[PDB]
Each structure stands twice: as structure tokens, then as C-alpha cells.
């Protein structure tokens, strides 16, 4: 057995985002979660940094 | 030091036999032995 | 408790002006910080074991 | 190269063969196989031979493996009926390393009881997987049928008693049946007297009923499309002059193959099944030899709906043989077998080492190929027709397999 | 009397050749009882699309009579002089041999010569031994350790004739007539091609005059290399209750001398079932960890040599919760292998491997074949003292050189069947063939 | 032999006596001592499971036994030891085997 | 039977190196991975960058 | 069988809050990691209220 599926913390990233089974099938249209999450942390930093002058 | 004849696994579906040629040498002719090891997979004879 | 009754005096110390008798005083409670942390309490945790035969 | 041999006053027996071969095997042969178990034991000699690498006084549960691994080593337990065999491979120069590891897992095992409860599923798990060739269900209800006490235990754990086969138990055994008296300390590739003075110093351990044949039968009613069977009646002692006319009535009827695929033309009963019944089948003379007692008979394999007709068509033949229908050339043919047979047998070193130990158990001392053979040869026809009369008439007992809707009882026969 | 000694003084195999060009090979020690045989170069390979599985019909029609003694006589005067007749093919090699008594060789030999050359094939022993082979593939459809074999075989080397079964489809056994065998024969069965092989009770030099007495008459096709194709063949089928899996790489193939090294380190990794008496305490550490976890039922090692090429890795058999765990601690250990092998557990191997060999080679049957076989393979017998000479020059060093080059950032062949759902996708098993980190 | 004085002073300031418990309830639960302790039979396992429920309960009162109850300096054996003397003795085999 | 079981052709899927059966893949197994990790490296590059 | 160990949010909240096996003997000083969210989130809204004008 592995560290991944043992440790506390990697085992919810390893269930979540690595060995999550996914559709073989799933489209374009299934990255804007993704995309989503990616916004949300360009608009945290950009904001800080933003905000450490506003 | 050498790996048996064959490899050993419970709940494993056995393998069939459907003809004379197959079938002889199955009927036992001499009293059981049972041998059980370190190394070697453990098999009983005739 | 000696090193809880020491970290109070470093707190009061620390409110004090940096002359006579309190730097002193500073040195030796923080002396006897680190020594409690680092030497007295291993030492006294293994006679506390020999005590008991183990 | 020839063997050498020496009984102790003590009763232990040491014979080795030194022949300068790189592999060096050695075997301590015990007679504590199921045999000498009771109704309050049972199972405890296959707990035990699941038990060796267990820790030892000398020696850690973990120092046997990895010690022994180390070297490139093996160690094997083999058990019979009536013995145990404790058997050590490896390249000579770590004969003795070896050797001490064989003494501890013999002499001085502590059978802890956190270890030997660790042990208990391993019980099932080889008795699982012996129970999956269906010759190990009949050969074992073969002789429970057959006997009232000593033979008729199984060499595998009744399933009542795993789980529950308790540290006091396997001490009991070993301290009862692991004596001076009772072993034979065999080898190859070591010299004689450094095997000797092993068992002087080390395996001088001081000392610690007869089987009555009953004749009855039990039937594993489980629905295969296949019907194992077997029927056998009491045979003769090994040892006695008897029991070599019995192996040469064996190989007369027929004992298993020798051509790949082949229709066997010369097996008197594979002939005598195949003139009746032309579907999917195996028939072979059944011959056990035991030092109290004997079974002699035959193993039909057969469809469900067949198995009377293949039963009966066998049985019909062993008594045309016990009527008189038997010629010279059947006789020697038959010998030729089990003289090639035999031989054949003690070819590999493995096989010898098993026939020295063996030997040295059930009789006095080692007798060469050679007087075997004569010995085949001195059965004259008489005895095998004497053999095949005691089958006819003998108290039977039988076993069976499948589904037995058209298998018969001893008394439909 | 010492083990370095011991290997000294080992009896030799003599060589000898025929006009026609069959070896004549053998080895001697007082024995009463003998084997004797015929190695041949022919086998799934060697047969094209057409006619796959010919090889394999032949075998079966091998002992069913000849033109000097038709149908049961053979079998009869095998059976009546004690002797024990049998035949195998390989993917490479057929090969027929009879262990007699030792006095019995000059016949023994005789009934070969008969076998081979004389072969009755006829019309309807081909019909019956016809439904005989239909029924065994059957048989060995219920076999999952063969079923994953031959689709690792299938997978690895697709597209050439290493991809094919010893046995052939279904569709040639119901088709292939007695013309197909008779012309297999005659280009296959020739004496260069073919070594007379011998252990026991004998002299030499006699057995190569019984070799002239009956196989002159013997007369006198290239093997293209075959591709290998880092694949996966999944056969899913839940409705079975344990997965079988099959992976390797590209070995080597039989003349190669990283063989031995090779040999070495699949000794380290070894073999496991769960009848094996060491469990926690065993020294390989994939056996360890599959007792402990229960991963497995069983597995082992193999490295399978071809001509130029082969199959090295791992075949095992578990629960269908297991196979991503056990594919990780596998190829975590080829990984620890090629990246960071020990002296001390290489010096097992080696033990392992020396041990392995020395009493494989117990008896006249196995040394009969070892002698058969070395002669086809390598064109010669390797003494035990040479093997025992490559084995020592094995250190540390080498064990991670040799496994690195077949093993590490190489694309395996994966073979799945069963409930294989768990069993991990080609990328994630391509990318555990190396470490971020050597 | 003269810190005799002391230990058995020592006993009694530590106090886990006073709680009905024997010194080899008090060690820390290390993965030797889990071993050592699986490998405890039924009765002193069960006594081990007793003596800790008894001073867990106190603990949680605040309390401590009656001073008749309370364990005695040389009532007090050593229970644990040859289970752990081994454990310990074992895994350095191993340790020393990895080497 | 199992053994009716063929795998299908890929010769449109193959590099051009690995699509002569009679040649071993070996020969090419270094320069494919060269490649194919020469893109991964390269991309490591520009996004380090 | 119950909605607080069904349901995927309540499942947390019943294993870390409601049925979280916790000894029968932990005293006073227990208390105070309670007390530190209690803290922190006491922190947090004042903090957020102040934000709001400062
Ligand atoms: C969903 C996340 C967010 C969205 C959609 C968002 C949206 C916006 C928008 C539309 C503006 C006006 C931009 C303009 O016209 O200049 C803005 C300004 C601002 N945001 Fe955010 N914001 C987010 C997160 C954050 C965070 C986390 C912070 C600070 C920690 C932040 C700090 C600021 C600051 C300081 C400004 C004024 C500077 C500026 O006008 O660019 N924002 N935000
Ligand atoms: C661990 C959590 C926090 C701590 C320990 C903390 C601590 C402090 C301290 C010591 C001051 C100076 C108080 C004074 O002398 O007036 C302060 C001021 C302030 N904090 Fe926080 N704070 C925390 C969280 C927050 C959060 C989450 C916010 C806003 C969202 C916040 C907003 C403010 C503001 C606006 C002030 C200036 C107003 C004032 O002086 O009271 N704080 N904080
Ligand atoms: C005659 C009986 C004496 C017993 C009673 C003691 C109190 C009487 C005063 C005597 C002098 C005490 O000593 C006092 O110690 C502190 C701390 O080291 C000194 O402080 C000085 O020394 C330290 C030495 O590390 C320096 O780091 C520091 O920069 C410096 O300010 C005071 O300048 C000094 O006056
Ligand atoms: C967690 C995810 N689950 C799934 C899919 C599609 C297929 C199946 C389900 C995803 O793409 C997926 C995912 C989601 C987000 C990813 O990047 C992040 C972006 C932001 C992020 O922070 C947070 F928490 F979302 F705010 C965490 C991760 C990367 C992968
Ligand atoms: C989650 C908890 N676990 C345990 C104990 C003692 C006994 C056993 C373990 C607790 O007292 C405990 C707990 C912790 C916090 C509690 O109130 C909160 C305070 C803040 C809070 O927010 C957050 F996430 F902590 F920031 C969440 C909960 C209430 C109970
Ligand atoms: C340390 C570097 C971290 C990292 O990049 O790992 C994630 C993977 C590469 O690892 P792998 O899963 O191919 O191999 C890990 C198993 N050894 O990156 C990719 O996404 C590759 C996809 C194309």
C-alpha cells in the first residue's frame, strides 16, 4: 500500500483529483469547473496585491 | 529454492476437463501425502 | 511550573526598562528556559524512569 | 559411491549416502503422522506440519526464514499416515547452518501461543486448497470408511478443531512422537560420521494401538457431472511377502498411464471399462501398504449416469483375474512396470532420500535395488491370483464423489 | 569435499554430430534407469497464419501408431517393457522423449526413430484426434493462468508469429488436413534442426550408434526477429472470481548473458502463494508485503526467453480489490532494483539462482531435456561450473545496470482477465516504470 | 540496595498507586508495547482493561481510593515485562538482519 | 476458444519506426522517448520561464 | 439508519462534533481549544464589523 491513500491530508487529494474515476467521454464543456477554481484563486492573489495598495 | 507446478488460490474456479485424454492419470492408485514449505507451493499427491 | 513561574518573569522583565537589576534577571530566566526545555526536564523525565526500574 | 547406515543403541537410525554432488539433502523422517492422532487430537499433526519457522529456542520465527532464505535454502514437511518427514535442501557448504535450523524446528520448537493461535487460518487455507483435487475428498473418506481408528484419521484438520488446536497440543506431540526411537536421520552430499555424531549429541531425546480395519463407506453427494469413486478391501502389511503380489495385481489391472494421450492397451481394467462405456472416463488399481494393515482395489472416474456401469465393469475384471484369466505374459508385463516403476521412483535424489528414510522406519535397514527387484520377481502367478481372490472375497469399503444417483452401495454391487 | 570443488567434478556432456547433421548429446553416471530423447526447432513460431496449431496436432498423432507398428503396437511395447513415453511443444520447441530401463536404451532409441520418421497419421486417427484438441481448448479456456499467458504473448509480440497460440484457433483444428501436417513435417523435422538427446546408464558412444542405426534416414526457414509492442489486453470479466494479470518487458532472449543477471534479480523479488510457510518473515520484500496486506493469492517472476527477444516480469492472481496494489509493489521493486540493489540480498539472489539450478537438474528426465534444449538454444551444454562462474561476476553493480536496461522507462506488455476494474490504466503503469527522483 | 530509600519515596509522590494501578499500566503506548500488549492472556489482559477503566473513572471524579486499596510498593509486579522484554528483543533481530 | 483471440491492427496508429514487424522496436526505443520527453522538457522550459 | 450519518455534510459534523468517541476523564484544560474557535471566530465578525469603518 501507498502514501496516498494512506496519509490523512493526500488521501483526500488522492480520492478528489487523482484517482477520481471520470467519464472516458466527458467534453470541452466539462474544463469550466476547473477554469472556475483557476479564476477564483486569480482573483484572491490579484486582489491581495491589489489590496495591499488600495 | 525452486516454485511449484502450480500456483495455489482459494476461491478460484478449477479447470474442467472434457475428454478421455485429459482425464487419465487423475484416478489415484497409492495412499495421500501432504507437504507444506518455506519456499515450495504446497500440493498433495496420490 | 518553573518554566511556566519563568516565563512569567520573562513577561515582566520584557515590560521592563533595559537597566539594573533587570537585565540580569533577563539573562538568567532566559538562561533557565532554554536549559529547562533543552537539559532539566530530558534529564529528570530518564531519573524519573531509573526511579521506577526502567 | 554407496550407502552407509547406523541404528544407535537409543533406536535412532542414520543413513547417508556421501556422493560429492553440489546440493546436499538432508531428512529427519518421524513416525508421527496422522495415524497417532485420537478423537481428542485430531488435526494437531497438520497444525504441526503447518508449524515449522515458528520460533524455536535457538532460533527466532524470523531467523529461520530469512536464515535459511539467505543461503538459498528450502525446508519442507511431508506428512503420510503413518509418518512425518522434516527435509533440508541446499549447496553443501551450508549443510550445517541448515542442519541446526532442522534441530530447532524438530527438537526444540516453543509453539508460542500467540504465534500458534496466528497459525489457526492457515489450517483452513491448505486444507481449502488440498480440498480442491477431489482425490484428496475420496483417498481421506476412502479410509475413514475403511477403518476404525489409526489409518482412518485424515492427514487435514477436521473443520470442527480449527481454530482450536491449542499450544499444549502440539508440545504433547511432539514430546510423545518425537523420540530417539521413532526417527531416521538421512542425507546426502555429508559424510557419515559427522551425520552420526549430529545425532549423538543432538537428537538423542528420550522415548514417548493397532489399526483395525472396519470396512464401510461414505458418499459426498455434490452434484459434479463427474463421479469419483473408489472401492478397495483389506490388502497386506508392507513388509511381507503379501503386499509384493498385491503391487504386481496393481500393475496387471492397470496403475495409471505411460503414453501421453495414449488408450492404454495393455491395462487390463482401462480395457475392460472402455468395451462397455465410451464416453469421458479413468480407471486405476488403487494399492495403500501400511506397517498394521493394507487397501487394495480400484479408482473409477466416470460420468454420473456411468459410474454403475464402470464400477461394476472394473470389479468384474479383478474377478476374472481372481477366477484364473491371467497369462505369464501379463505377469511379466506387469512386473516389468513396477521393476521400472520402482527404480524410476528412486532416479532423483529427492525420491531416494524418501525411500532410505522410508525404509528405515518401517523396517530395520536399507535394502538395495537390487533385492527389490529379485524380490518382484520371486511373486510367482499363484500370488497374484491369491491377491485378486482376497479382493473378491474381502469385507469391502468404499467411497465416493458427484453426483452419485446412479453410483452404487457396497451391497448393489 | 567443498561446493567450488564439487562443480569440478560433475559429469560432462559429450557432443557428437551425424552425416546428416543431428547431434548426438549425452551424459553418463551408473544409473539404472535412463532418459532419452529428440529436441526439435519447430513450433508456434515457425508456423504461419494457415497452418498455427500443426505443431500441436502432430503431438497428438505422434504415439497413435507408425508404418512399422500400427496404431495401439507403439503404445503396446512402451507399456509392456516398462517404459514411459511423453511429448511437449513450446512456442520454439517440440520435443518427444521415453524413460526406460537402462538395458532397454537400443529399443528405447528404436521406438523415437519410429515416432518421428514413420509417423502414421492417419485419416481416421486426424477426425478423432480432431475434436480431442477442440475439446482441450475448451478445457483450457477454464485455465485463466494460460488465458493471460497467451494474451500477454498476443499483445507483446502482435502482428508476427510469436503472437500466436502453441494450440491454434478453433477455425485450423477444424480445418487442417493431412496434407498441412505432412508438409509441416517434411520442413520442419530435419536432422540440423533436431539433437538426439540422452541421461543415465549409457555409454556414449553407444548411443550414437543406435542414433545412425535409425535416425540416418532423417534429412537435411529462418525465424524473422520479432517486434515487441508495449500493449494491454484487458479481457474483462467480472463474472470470475479472482483477476489473473500478466506484465513484462522485452527481455533478452536466450543467448544473451544478461540472462543470468537477470535470473538473479527475479530471484531477489522471487515468489509467493499463500501456502508459503514464511509470510511476514520472508526475505523478499513484494512476498512480505503481499502476506501482511493479503494482496495476492499468488505470484512470480518469470523472464520467458525467445530466439531474439522474450518476456520478463510478473504474472499474479488476486482479489479484484488488490490489482492496483500489487501492480505498485511490483513495480516498486523493479524500480528499487535497477535504482538501488544491495550487495547483501543480491548475494541471496545469487544463492537463490545457484540453489535453483543445481537441484532443478535432479534425475535423468530433466538433465535428458536440460541437454536437449541447451544444444537448440545456446548450440551447446553450459557445465554447471560456467554457470556458477557468471553468477559470482553478478555484484550490486551489475543487478542495477542489467535490470535498468530492461525495466526502467521501458513500455511494458500488460495482460488483464477477470474482474480486472481495478486493474490501472496503461499511463499510470507506463509511468510507474520510473522514479522522480534516480 | 540504598536508593531503596528513594524509589519507594518516589512511588508514592508519582501516586499512580492511589488510582489502583500497577506500573506497566502507566507506560505509553508504543508500537512495541501494543505488540507486548496483544500478546497478553485473558486475565491479565482483562485486568490491564479493568485497573485503567477503575482510574479513568476516578480521574474523571477527581477522586482517588480509599489508602487500604491503594497499590502497594511491593505488591507491585512487573506484569508486562516479558512480553516486551521480547517484543523489543525480536525487532532488533530484524533491525540487525537489515543490516 | 481464447486462442481465436487476434489483436487488431494498428498500423494506423504506429510511428513509422515500429511499424516493420520483422524488426525489433529496441533499435527506435531510445529515439521515441527522446522525442516525446524533448516536448515535455521543452514545455517545462517555456512555463519556467 | 439515521440522516446525520447519511447525509455527506452531516456525516462530518456527526463523526467530529455529535458521536466523536471522546475519553470520559479529560478535564478543564480540554476546554480550551474550544475556546480558541470560539476565539477566532469571535475575532473574525468583530474584526469584519470594524473593517466595515476603518
Ligand atoms: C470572485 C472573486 C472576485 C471578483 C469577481 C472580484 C471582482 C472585482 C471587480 C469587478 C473589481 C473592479 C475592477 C475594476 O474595474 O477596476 C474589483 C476590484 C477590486 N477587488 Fe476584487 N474581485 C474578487 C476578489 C477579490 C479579493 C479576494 C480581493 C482582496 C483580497 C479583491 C480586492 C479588490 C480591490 C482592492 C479592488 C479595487 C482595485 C481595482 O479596482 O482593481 N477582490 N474586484
Ligand atoms: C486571529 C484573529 C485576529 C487577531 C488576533 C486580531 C488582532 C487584532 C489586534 C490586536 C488589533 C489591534 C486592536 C487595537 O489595539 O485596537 C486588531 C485591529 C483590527 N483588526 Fe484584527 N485581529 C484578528 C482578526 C481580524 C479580522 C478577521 C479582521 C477583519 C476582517 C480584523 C480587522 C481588524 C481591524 C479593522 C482592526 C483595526 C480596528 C481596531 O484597532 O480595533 N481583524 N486586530
Ligand atoms: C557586593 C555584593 C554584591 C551582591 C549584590 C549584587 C548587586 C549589586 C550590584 C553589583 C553589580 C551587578 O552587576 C550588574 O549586572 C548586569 C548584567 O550582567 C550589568 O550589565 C552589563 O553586563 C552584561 C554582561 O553580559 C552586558 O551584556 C550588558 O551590556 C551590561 O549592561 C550591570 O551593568 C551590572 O551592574
Ligand atoms: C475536483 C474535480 N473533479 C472533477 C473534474 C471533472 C471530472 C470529474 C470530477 C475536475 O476537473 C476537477 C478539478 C477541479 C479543480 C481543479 O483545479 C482547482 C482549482 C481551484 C481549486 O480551489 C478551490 F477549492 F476550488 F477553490 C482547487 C482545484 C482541478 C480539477
Ligand atoms: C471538534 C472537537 N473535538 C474534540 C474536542 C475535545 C474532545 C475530543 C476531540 C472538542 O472540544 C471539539 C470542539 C471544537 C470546537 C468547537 O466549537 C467550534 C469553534 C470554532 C469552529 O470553527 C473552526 F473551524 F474551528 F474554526 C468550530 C467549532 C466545539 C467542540
Ligand atoms: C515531481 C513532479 C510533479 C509532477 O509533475 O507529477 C505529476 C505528473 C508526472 O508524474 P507521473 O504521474 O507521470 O509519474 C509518477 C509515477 N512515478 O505530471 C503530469 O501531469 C504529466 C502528464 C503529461
Redesign the interface.
Known amino acids: 500500500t501507498n502514501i496516498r491513500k494512506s496519509h490523512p491530508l493526500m488521501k483526500i487529494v488522492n480520492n478528489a483529483f487523482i484517482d477520481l474515476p471520470a467519464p472516458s467521454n466527458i467534453s470541452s464543456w466539462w474544463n469550466f469547473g476547473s477554469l472556475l477554481g483557476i479564476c477564483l484563486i486569480l482573483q484572491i492573489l490579484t486582489g491581495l496585491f491589489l489590496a495591499m495598495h488600495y | 529454492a525452486v516454485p511449484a507446478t502450480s500456483e495455489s488460490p482459494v476461491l478460484d474456479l478449477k479447470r474442467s476437463v472434457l475428454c478421455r485424454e485429459s482425464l487419465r492419470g487423475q484416478a489415484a492408485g497409492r495412499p495421500l501425502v501432504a507437504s507444506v514449505s518455506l519456499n515450495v507451493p504446497a500440493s498433495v499427491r496420490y | 511550573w518553573a518554566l511556566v513561574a519563568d516565563l512569567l518573569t520573562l513577561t515582566w522583565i520584557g515590560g521592563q526598562p533595559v537597566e539594573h537589576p533587570y537585565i540580569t534577571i533577563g539573562q538568567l530566566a532566559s538562561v533557565l528556559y532554554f536549559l529547562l526545555i533543552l537539559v532539566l526536564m530530558p534529564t529528570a523525565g530518564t531519573i524519573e524512569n531509573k526511579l521506577l526500574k526502567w | 559411491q554407496d550407502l552407509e547406515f547406523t541404528r544407535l543403541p537409543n533406536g535412532l537410525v542414520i543413513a547417508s549416502l556421501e556422493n560429492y554432488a553440489p546440493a546436499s539433502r538432508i531428512g529427519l523422517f518421524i513416525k508421527a503422522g496422522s495415524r497417532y492422532e485420537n478423537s481428542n487430537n485430531l488435526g494437531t499433526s497438520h497444525l504441526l506440519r503447518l508449524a515449522s519457522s515458528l520460533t524455536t529456542k535457538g532460533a527466532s520465527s524470523f531467523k529461520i526464514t530469512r536464515g535459511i532464505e539467505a543461503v538459498g535454502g528450502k525446508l519442507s514437511v511431508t506428512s503420510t499416515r503413518e509418518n512425518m518427514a522434516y527435509t533440508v535442501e541446499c549447496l553443501r557448504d551450508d549443510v550445517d547452518i541448515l542442519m541446526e535450523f532442522l534441530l530447532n524446528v524438530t527438537t526444540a520448537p516453543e509453539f508460542r501461543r500467540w504465534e500458534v493461535a496466528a497459525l489457526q487460518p492457515q489450517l483452513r487455507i491448505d486444507k481449502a486448497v488440498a480440498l480442491q483435487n477431489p482425490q484428496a475428498h475420496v483417498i481421506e473418506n476412502l479410509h475413514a470408511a475403511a477403518y476404525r481408528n489409526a489409518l482412518a484419521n485424515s492427514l487435514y484438520c477436521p473443520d470442527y478443531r480449527i481454530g482450536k488446536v491449542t499450544p499444549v497440543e502440539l508440545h504433547d506431540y511432539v514430546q510423545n512422537h518425537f523420540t530417539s526411537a521413532r526417527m531416521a536421520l538421512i542425507g546426502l552430499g555429508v559424510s557419515h560420521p559427522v551425520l552420526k555424531q549430529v545425532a549423538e549429541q543432538f537428537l538423542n531425546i528420550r522415548g514417548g494401538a493397532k489399526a483395525k480395519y472396519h470396512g464401510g463407506e461414505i458418499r459426498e453427494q455434490n452434484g459434479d457431472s463427474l463421479v469419483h469413486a473408489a472401492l478397495v478391501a483389506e490388502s497386506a502389511a508392507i513388509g511381507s511377502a503379501e503386499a509384493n503380489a498385491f503391487s504386481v495385481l496393481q500393475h496387471v489391472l492397470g496403475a495409471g498411464p505411460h503414453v501421453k494421450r495414449g488408450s492404454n492397451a495393455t491395462s487390463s481394467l482401462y480395457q475392460a471399462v472402455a468395451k462397455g462405456v465410451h464416453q469421458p472416463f479413468d480407471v486405476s488399481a488403487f494399492n495403500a501398504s501400511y506397517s498394521d494393515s493394507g487397501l487394495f482395489g480400484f479408482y473409477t472416474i466416470s460420468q454420473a449416469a456411468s459410474a454403475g456401469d464402470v464400477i461394476k465393469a472394473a470389479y468384474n475384471q479383478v474377478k476374472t483375474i481372481a477366477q484364473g484369466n491371467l497369462s505369464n505374459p501379463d505377469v511379466q508385463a506387469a512386473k516389468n512396470k513396477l521393476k521400472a516403476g520402482y527404480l524410476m521412483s528412486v532416479e532423483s535424489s529427492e525420491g531416494f532420500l524418501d525411500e532410505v528414510g522410508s525404509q528405515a522406519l518401517a523396517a530395520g535397514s536399507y535394502t538395495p535395488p537390487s533385492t527389490v527387484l529379485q524380490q518382484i520377481d520371486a511373486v510367482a502367478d499363484a500370488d497374484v491370483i491369491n491377491a485378486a481372490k482376497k479382493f473378491v472375497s474381502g469385507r469391502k469399503s468404499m467411497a465416493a464423489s458427484g453426483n452419485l444417483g446412479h453410483t452404487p452401495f457396497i451391497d448393489e454391487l | 569435499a567443498t561446493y567450488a570443488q564439487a562443480l569440478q567434478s560433475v559429469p560432462e556432456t559429450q557432443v557428437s554430430q551425424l552425416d546428416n547433421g543431428l547431434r548426438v548429446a549425452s551424459e553418463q553416471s551408473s544409473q539404472p534407469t535412463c532418459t532419452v530423447g529428440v529436441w526439435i526447432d519447430a513450433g508456434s513460431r515457425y508456423e504461419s497464419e494457415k497452418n498455427n496449431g500443426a505443431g500441436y496436432f502432430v503431438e497428438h498423432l505422434a504415439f497413435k501408431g507408425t508404418k512399422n507398428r500400427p496404431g495401439n503396437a507403439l503404445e503396446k511395447e512402451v507399456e509392456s517393457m516398462g517404459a514411459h513415453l511423453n511429448a511437449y511443444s513450446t512456442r520454439e520447441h517440440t520435443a518427444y522423449y521415453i524413460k526406460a530401463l537402462s538395458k532397454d536404451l537400443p529399443k528405447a532409441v528404436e521406438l523415437l526413430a519410429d515416432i518421428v520418421q514413420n509417423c502414421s497419421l492417419e485419416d481416421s486417427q486426424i477426425e478423432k484426434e480432431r475434436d480431442v484438441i477442440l475439446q482441450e481448448l475448451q478445457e483450457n479456456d477454464t485455465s485463466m493462468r494460460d488465458v493471460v499467458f497467451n494474451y500477454l504473448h498476443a499483445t507483446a509480440f502482435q502482428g508476427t508469429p510469436l503472437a500466436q497460440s502453441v494450440e491454434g484457433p478453433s477455425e485450423n483444428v477444424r480445418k487442417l488436413s493431412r496434407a498441412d501436417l505432412t508438409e509441416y513435417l517434411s520442413r520442419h523435422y530435419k536432422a540440423p534442426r533436431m539433437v538426439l538427446a540422452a541421461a543415465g546408464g549409457l555409454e556414449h558412444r553407444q548411443l550414437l550408434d543406435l542414433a545412425q542405426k535409425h535416425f540416418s534416414g532423417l534429412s537435411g526457414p529462418t525465424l524473422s526477429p520479432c517486434r515487441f509492442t508495449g500493449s494491454q489486453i484487458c479481457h474483462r470479466e467480472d463474472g470470475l472470481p479472482l483477476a489473473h494479470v500478466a506484465i513484462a518487458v522485452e527481455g533478452p532472449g536466450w543467448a544473451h548473458p544478461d540472462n543470468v543477471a537477470l535470473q538473479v534479480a527475479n530471484a531477489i523479488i522471487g515468489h509467493y502463494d499463500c501456502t508459503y510457510g514464511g509470510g511476514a518473515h520472508l526475505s523478499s520484500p513484494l512476498a512480505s508485503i503481499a502476506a501482511t496486506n493479503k494482496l495476492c493469492q499468488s505470484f512470480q517472476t518469470f523472464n520467458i526467453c525467445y530466439a531474439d527477444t522474450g518476456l520478463l516480469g510478473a504474472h499474479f492472481v488476486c482479489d479484484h480489490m488488490s490489482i492496483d496494489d500489487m501492480m505498485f509493489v511490483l513495480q516498486g521493486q523493479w524500480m528499487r532494483l535497477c535504482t538501488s540493489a544491495t550487495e547483501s540480498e543480491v548475494l541471496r539472489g545469487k544463492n537463490l539462482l545457484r540453489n535453483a539450478l543445481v537441484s532443478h537438474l535432479d534425475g535423468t528426465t530433466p538433465v535428458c531435456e536440460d541437454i536437449g534444449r541447451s544444444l537448440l538454444t545456446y548450440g551447446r551444454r553450459i557445465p554447471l561450473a560456467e554457470w556458477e562462474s557468471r553468477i559470482a561476476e553478478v555484484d550490486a553493480r551489475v543487478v542495477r545496470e542489467v535490470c535498468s536496461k530492461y525495466f526502467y522507462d521501458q513500455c511494458p506488455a500488460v495482460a488483464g482477465f477477470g474482474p480486472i476494474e481495478q486493474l490501472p490504466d496503461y499511463n499510470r503503469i507506463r509511468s510507474g516504470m520510473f522514479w522522480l527522483r534516480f | 540496595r540504598w536508593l531503596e530509600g528513594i524509589r519507594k519515596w518516589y512511588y508514592n509522590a508519582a501516586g499512580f498507586n492511589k488510582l489502583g494501578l500497577m506500573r506497566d499500566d502507566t507506560i505509553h503506548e508504543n508500537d512495541d508495547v501494543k505488540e507486548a500488549i496483544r500478546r497478553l492472556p485473558e486475565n491479565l489482559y482483562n485486568d490491564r482493561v479493568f485497573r485503567i477503566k477503575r482510574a479513568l473513572d476516578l480521574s474523571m471524579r477527581q477522586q482517588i481510593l480509599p489508602k487500604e486499596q491503594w497499590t502497594k510498593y511491593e505488591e507491585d509486579k512487573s506484569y508486562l515485562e516479558p512480553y516486551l522484554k521480547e517484543v523489543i528483543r525480536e525487532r532488533k533481530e530484524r533491525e540487525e538482519w537489515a543490516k | 476458444?481464447?486462442?481465436?483471440?487476434?489483436?487488431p491492427?494498428?498500423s494506423d496508429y504506429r510511428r513509422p519506426e515500429?511499424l516493420?514487424?520483422?524488426?525489433?522496436?529496441?533499435e527506435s526505443?531510445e529515439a521515441r522517448?527522446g522525442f516525446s520527453y524533448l516536448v515535455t522538457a521543452t514545455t517545462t522550459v517555456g512555463v519556467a520561464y
Do not use: A, E, R
Not at chain 7, 476458444?1 to 489483436?7: A, P
Open positions: 476458444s481464447h486462442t481465436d483471440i487476434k489483436v491492427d494498428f515500429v516493420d514487424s520483422t524488426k525489433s522496436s529496441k526505443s522517448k
